[PDB]
């Protein structure tokens, strides 16, 4: 499923807040947030 408007879903129904993306922290289990595509680094 999908998470709410204030949550960004990484993978496998685990979502983090919008400010928690590209903030030097792999909060998610799949670490999809800091990937070169979403972060660009």
Kindly list the residues in this chain that would bind other proteins in the complex (CB under 8 A).
19, 21-24
Give me the count of residues in the chain.
Answer: 41
From the CB of 24, what's the least distance to other proteins, in Å? 6
Count of residues in contact with Ca ion, rule CB under 5 A: 5
* Out of 25, 29, 38, 39, the residue judged to bind Ca ion by CB under 5 A: 25
Query: Quick one: 12 or 24, whose CB is closer to other proteins?
Result: 24
How far apart CA 34 and CA 21 sit, in angstroms, is 7
How far CA 9 is from CA of 12, 38, 41, in Å, comes to 8, 12, 20
């Amino acid at each position: 499923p999908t998470c709410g408007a204030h949550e960004f879903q990484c993978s496998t129904s685990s979502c983090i807040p919008i400010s928690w993306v590209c903030d030097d922290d792999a909060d998610c289990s799949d670490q999809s947030d800091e990937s070169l595509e979403q972060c660009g680094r």
